[PDB]
Structure 1
Amino acid sequence: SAAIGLFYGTQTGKTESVAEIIRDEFGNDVVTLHDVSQAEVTDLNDYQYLIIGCPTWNIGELQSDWEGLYSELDDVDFNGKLVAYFGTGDQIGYADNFQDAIGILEEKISQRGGKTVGYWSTDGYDFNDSKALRNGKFVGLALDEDNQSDLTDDRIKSWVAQLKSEFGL
């Protein structure tokens, strides 16, 4: 297996596009993409480094495929894993629930032993509240393809360099 498993869900394809750009930055032989619409929770056993990608849907909820797999996360352990998070979301239209999904996923995975890496500054976002907040930072990379698509590539580039260092790769 590759070093990093990137498990993403997507409804309108935006988080998947972001997943592909992250894979391109790390390299094809470093990151393997797993669409959680077809993944089994035991797939997570194949990796000591994880990237969890999830947009927030209506409203403050996990993307439907990730919602489906969320209950099964208790059937697997994350001891010794390093885990990063990214999501797409809409900070203008959903300012009270911006990036809730990655907050919800990290809460669970860290409770099951996964150590979170890749915290991200809230600088440059306009929102009211988020379940991804952790001591004034986002729990992971927050992208906004609806309102800030022109910032996405630079954000990913900066985050992956940061992440590579935190993973120790």
Structure 2
Amino acid sequence: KIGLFYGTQTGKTESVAEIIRDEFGNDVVTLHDVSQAEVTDLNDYQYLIIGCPTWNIGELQSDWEGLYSELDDVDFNGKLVAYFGTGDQAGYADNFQDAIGILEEKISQRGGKTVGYWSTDGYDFNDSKALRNGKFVGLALDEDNQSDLTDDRIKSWVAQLKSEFGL
């Protein structure tokens, strides 16, 4: 029912995808590491969760970068799309969560209806390509600075998405 497509450099978004899966049900969510994925794998789901950390100051994580150049080959109309990222707001206050911002911008143009928007309250940052009229395009996690907050963030966003998705 939901395909969660994640990239990871140092394992944190992956560890977070697993918590997400387990919050919905591991029956409801299928995980796909986008290092092993085909862009046409995204066609298999009408409900997508897109996980990407921002790397090297504002860049997509390297596996998502590879897939990004082909998002063009896919039709996202009729799909509902949620985004999550891991990032470091203290180290990169100017580019916090840019990657999910970049991914959503593209997937949105190609058809996908974004669900899963999230309050910027309680984050300390200057700018982000994830910002959308005062909210983040999706769940912003910081395992570097706010890891005590992650569990309850995920529980709360997942409950939100169960509603947005119709589950």
TM-score of the pair, normalised by structure 1: 0.98
Partner-residue secondary structure (3-state), 1:10: coil
- Counterpart mapping for 1:129-148 below 5 A: 129-148=127-146
> 2:71 and 2:59 mapped to 1: Cα distance?
16
> 1:133 and 1:57 mapped to 2: Cα distance?
17
Partner-residue secondary structure (3-state), 1:85: strand
**1:28-80 deviation line (CA, Å, top 9, x unaligned):** 11000000001000001110000000000001000000000001100010010
**1:92-146 deviation line (CA, Å, top 9, x unaligned):** 0000000000000000000000000000000000000000000000000000000
Partner-residue secondary structure (3-state), 2:70: helix
Q: CA deviation at 1:166?
A: 0.5
Q: Residue 154 of structure 1 aligns with which residue?
A: 152
Q: Residue 68 of structure 1 aligns with which residue?
A: 66
Q: Residue 78 of structure 1 aligns with which residue?
A: 76
> 1:76 and 1:139 mapped to 2: Cα distance?
21
**1:3-44 deviation line (CA, Å, top 9, x unaligned):** x00000000000000000000000011000000001000001
> 2:124 and 2:57 mapped to 1: Cα distance?
18
> 2:71 and 2:126 mapped to 1: Cα distance?
29
> 1:42 and 1:142 mapped to 2: Cα distance?
26
> 2:39 and 2:127 mapped to 1: Cα distance?
30
**Gap runs ≥5 in structure 2:** none
Runs (4+) of structure 1 exceeding 3 A deviation are none
Partner-residue secondary structure (3-state), 1:84: strand
What do you get for the CA RMSD once the two structures are aligned? 0.3
- Counterpart mapping for 1:9-158 below 5 A: 9-158=7-156
> 1:28 and 1:118 mapped to 2: Cα distance?
19
Equivalent residue pairs, number: 166
> 1:89 and 1:79 mapped to 2: Cα distance?
29
Partner-residue secondary structure (3-state), 1:44: helix
> 2:145 and 2:112 mapped to 1: Cα distance?
31
Percent same amino acid at aligned positions? 99
Partner-residue secondary structure (3-state), 1:157: helix
Q: CA deviation at 1:82?
A: 0.1
Q: CA deviation at 1:81?
A: 0.1
